[PDB]
Design a protein around this nucleic acid. Sequence first.
DNA 1: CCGACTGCGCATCAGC
DNA 2: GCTGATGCGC
DNA 3: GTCGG
Length: 326
Amino acid sequence: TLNGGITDMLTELANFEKNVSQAIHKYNAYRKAASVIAKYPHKIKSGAEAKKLPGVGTKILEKIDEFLATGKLRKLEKIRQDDTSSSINFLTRVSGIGPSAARKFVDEGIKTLEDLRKNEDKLNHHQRIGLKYFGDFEKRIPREEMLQMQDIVLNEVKKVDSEYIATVCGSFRRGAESSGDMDVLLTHPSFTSESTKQPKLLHQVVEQLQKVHFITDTLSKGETKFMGVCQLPSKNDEKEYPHRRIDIRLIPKDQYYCGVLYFTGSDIFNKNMRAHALEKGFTINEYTIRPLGVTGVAGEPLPVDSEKDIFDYIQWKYREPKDRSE
DNA sequence: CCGACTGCGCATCAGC
DNA sequence: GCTGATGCGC
DNA sequence: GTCGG
Ligand SMILES: Nc1ncnc2c1ncn2[C@H]1C[C@H](O)[C@@H](COP(=O)(O)OP(=O)(O)C(Br)(Br)P(=O)(O)O)O1
Ligand SMILES: [Cl-]
Ligand SMILES: [Cl-]
Ligand SMILES: [Mg+2]
Ligand code: NA
Ligand code: NA
Ligand code: NA
């Protein structure tokens, strides 16, 4: 990667602002600058050259100059030496522990994996599962395992009702050679924007995946969104596979294209594309694209027959999933 | 100079 | 219980 | 932290 030193710096700065400063717009500004620099096809020689790119302003250009001259950023060197920042950043690596809870735990003297492990009763259910699988959730998933997981999920969904359609999205659908988790978009003709003619549509699928011991834990679960934990089966004498995060999102079948656009991402790609829609007078979510009136009020959903239709409304050339990894 | 920054489901809690 | 934040992770 | 008007 051509500018990895710079993008790593900006990412660590983004994480500092989110986790410690609790400054969500600085976090997003740093992530935006990292993303645009990551796609820039030249090795950056100067902060001024970087400042040409949209999202790199004066302050990041200065940081880039410092990094290029010295190989480091004093601001980050000091953050790394600060105990409270160090503790908060570590605690937020547990799934379910965010900026707020991390800072509250540090106040209470809970500041290490050992402290968490002996204070399990101070964790909510999500945090408790996050701690249990702390090590596993740091491991990435090779695409070859994602293919096995996909096969299980699709076949088990088929056994519940052959009219379900499950689509693995996320980085997998963008063609990545490894993924951080598995994201599954689910549809069924009974659930549309017009009516829900069968209950428990998501529950049935989760239950079947639990039945065959693929889903092992639940982080949260409602009528349309499941977040939990899964594990591939292993063979005789073989070490067990790590536990993996799995998300399942049930979307109205007639809104599949907005939903698969959303769940394919990346997150920054969605953010960039939704920001462009707003400039063009539309708002995009995982359900619909709608015009915005002058009052800022969204209007009726526009018809959508493909992912490209959504690109067309906002006057973007279509981008294949493999080219949305921003 | 400064308002606006993508969008939302599920968990948790406060106030009534 | 309901309603409306706030937190969190997508 | 960045940027459009
Ligand atoms: N804040 C956000 N805003 C808009 N869309 C978002 C979003 N967060 C997530 N999405 C959309 C967009 C996103 O692609 C999808 C899945 O969210 P994952 O967190 O699983 O992201 P992924 O791409 O699968 C990665 Br590379 Br992080 P992996 O999980 O393989 O490590 O939900
Ligand atoms: Cl901010
Ligand atoms: Cl909508
Ligand atoms: Mg994912
Ligand atoms: Na710029
Ligand atoms: Na966390
Ligand atoms: Na996910």
